[PDB]
């Protein structure tokens, strides 16, 4: 209560708040959750944080309905420190095209707009950097990386930058593709970040620390050599080559969780060895509230400060007491437990099939539509399990096919990828081309592209499959299945338009660490997060 400095965090009770509070306590502070305006008073609050995720209107409505507008404004007028995160920062603007009818606190008189997806994938999911400038603040370092996950942003141009300057605002800029946007803002006692510091490893913790301590450390004296190596060259739109570490979560004979301190320690190890993200593949008469996978996330979230994804089990379920819990709420539970993204599998295929059946339209009942409308496309990833099928010509199937470089058994020069469901035990008559385009239309923000035929092989990724999917959709595509050695990552990043690469057994077996891969990619002129 007064034995350590207390930090007040406004909680609209939606999304992952585990990481932020764990980050604050890790820094030696006591967290005080404010769910109601009654939970805090101006004079007794010295450090306030406004975190937010998901749909703009969804967040701001929740915020002002609970009665936080006046309290927030009064706190700001007192001159005391406030920090906004993600939607917390966008809540400072006039509003957002994302939610046409929503109004913001309007400290910055323009609205957030969506990134241009004709030249790059949207949402932006990855590690971007702050453009070098004389007016940076709170230790933001151009040579370090921060994690961004959003579709909308305060996109800048010459006029807006000048107006902000004359307005007395200090801006930390970033660029994704050809678009320049606001990475962070600072004016008097207001500080806000578009990226998630609690998801940005050590670099992120530093930013939270500098804010809590009200300090703007000078950036390290990097050698011209180090700068040229750590600087953003705007390859891959300005995002580093994202390396994901994946692990399975099973229930053994005795009922314990295995690959509950095993899945937890391995995720910690992955994190410590440089993983940019940790994905848990959940393959498990237990009540939803007591699902052991949820404890794994919660425990992992105490020290792993990078995004966490969980696949498997995120669907409509009937609890032990017969309660009907829809996908959306099951997801909310994993999110509040430490998860940042949820991977949909089998349902994705059903949803896509229905989509085409309805004449290429969604009816809003799929887990993809519900979770994404609440948390944003960035919170939903589609796990696809496809396998190559050869045909003599586009005429042998209704699905989209492409001319392959590797002829089939009978000399077939064309093929399509047939999707499966239920852990790849059952195939459907839907190509990966159609599955991904439908899911994207339904609101998915990213594709986790597995490949049955390469899975477990350790001989590299199916390169034509990656290109086939990149031709189909505009959302980020993750290369999965086949990774064995660092060179496989190099090949995907240089020979294909893959937006990220996932590795499983190679990291689990200790053959290579994420750092080994990063060191190798780094040695080959690729940009990678190093923290
Ligand atoms: Ni105390």
UniProtKB/Swiss-Prot annotation:
Description of what induces expression: By amino acid starvation. It has a GCN4-dependent and a GCN4-independent (basal) expression.
Keyword Zinc-finger: no
This protein's record includes keyword Lyase: yes
Residues holding substrate: 313, 450
Pathway the protein takes part in: Amino-acid biosynthesis; L-histidine biosynthesis; L-histidine from 5-phospho-alpha-D-ribose 1-diphosphate: step 5/9
Active site: 86 (for gatase activity), 196 (for gatase activity), 198 (for gatase activity), 248, 385
Record's miscellaneous remark: Present with 11800 molecules/cell in log phase SD medium.
Chain's role: IGPS catalyzes the conversion of PRFAR and glutamine to IGP, AICAR and glutamate. The glutaminase domain produces the ammonia necessary for the cyclase domain to produce IGP and AICAR from PRFAR. The ammonia is channeled to the active site of the cyclase domain.
Family: In the C-terminal section; belongs to the HisA/HisF family.
Record protein name field: Imidazole glycerol phosphate synthase hisHF
Provenance organism: Saccharomyces cerevisiae (strain ATCC 204508 / S288c) (Baker's yeast)
Lineage of the organism: Eukaryota, Fungi, Dikarya, Ascomycota, Saccharomycotina
């Amino acid at each position: 209560g007064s034995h350590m400095p207390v930090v007040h965090v406004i909680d609209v009770e939606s999304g992952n708040l585990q990481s932020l509070t764990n980050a604050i306590e890790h820094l030696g502070y006591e967290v005080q959750l404010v769910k109601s305006p009654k939970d805090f008073n101006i004079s007794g609050t010295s450090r306030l944080i406004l975190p937010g995720v998901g749909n703009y209107g969804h967040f701001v409505d929740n915020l002002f309905n609970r009665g936080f507008e006046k309290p927030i404004r009064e706190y700001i007028e007192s001159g005391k420190p406030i920090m906004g995160i993600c939607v917390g920062l966008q809540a400072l603007f006039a509003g957002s095209v994302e939610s046409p009818k929503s109004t913001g606190l309007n400290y910055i008189d323009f609205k957030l707009s969506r990134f241009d997806d004709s030249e790059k994938p949207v949402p932006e999911i990855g590690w971007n950097s702050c453009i070098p400038s004389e007016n940076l603040f709170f230790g933001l370092d151009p040579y370090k990386r921060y994690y961004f996950v959003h579709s909308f942003a305060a996109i800048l141009n010459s006029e807006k930058k000048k107006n902000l300057e004359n307005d007395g605002w200090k801006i930390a800029k970033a660029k994704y593709g050809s678009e320049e946007f606001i990475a962070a803002v600072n004016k008097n006692n207001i500080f806000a970040t578009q990226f998630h510091p609690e998801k940005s490893g050590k670099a992120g913790l530093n930013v939270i620390e500098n804010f809590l301590k009200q300090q703007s450390p000078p950036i390290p004296n990097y050698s011209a050599e180090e700068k040229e190596l750590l600087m953003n060259d705007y390859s891959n739109y300005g995002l580093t080559r994202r390396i994901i570490a994946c692990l399975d979560v099973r229930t053994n004979d005795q009922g314990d969780l295995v690959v509950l301190g095993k899945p937890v320690q391995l995720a910690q190890k992955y994190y410590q060895q440089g993983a940019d993200e940790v994905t848990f593949l959940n393959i498990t008469d237990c009540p939803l509230k007591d699902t052991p996978m949820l404890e794994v996330l919660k425990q992992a979230a105490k020290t792993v400060f990078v995004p966490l994804t969980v696949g498997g089990g995120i669907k409509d379920i009937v609890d032990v007491d017969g309660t009907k819990i829809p996908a959306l709420e099951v997801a909310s539970l994993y999110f509040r437990s430490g998860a940042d993204k949820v991977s949909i599998g089998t349902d994705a295929v059903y949803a896509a099939e229905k989509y085409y059946e309805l004449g290429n339209r969604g009816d809003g009942t799929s887990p993809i539509e519900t979770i994404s409308k609440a948390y944003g496309a960035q919170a939903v990833v589609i796990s696809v399990d496809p396998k190559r099928v050869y045909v003599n010509s586009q005429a042998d199937t209704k699905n989209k096919v492409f001319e392959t470089e590797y002829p089939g058994p009978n000399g077939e020069k064309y093929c399509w990828y047939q999707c499966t469901i239920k852990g790849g035990r059952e195939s459907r008559d839907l190509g990966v081309w159609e599955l991904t385009r439908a899911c994207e239309a339904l609101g998915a923000g990213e594709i986790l592209l597995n490949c049955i035929d390469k899975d477990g092989s350790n001989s590299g990724y199916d390169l034509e499959l990656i290109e086939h999917v990149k031709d189909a959709v505009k959302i980020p595509v993750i290369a999965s299945s086949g990774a064995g050695v660092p060179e496989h990552f190099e090949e995907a990043f240089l020979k294909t338009r893959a937006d990220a690469c996932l590795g499983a057994g190679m990291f689990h077996r200790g053959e290579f660490t994420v750092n080994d891969v990063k060191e190798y990619l780094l040695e080959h002129g690729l940009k990678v997060r190093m923290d």
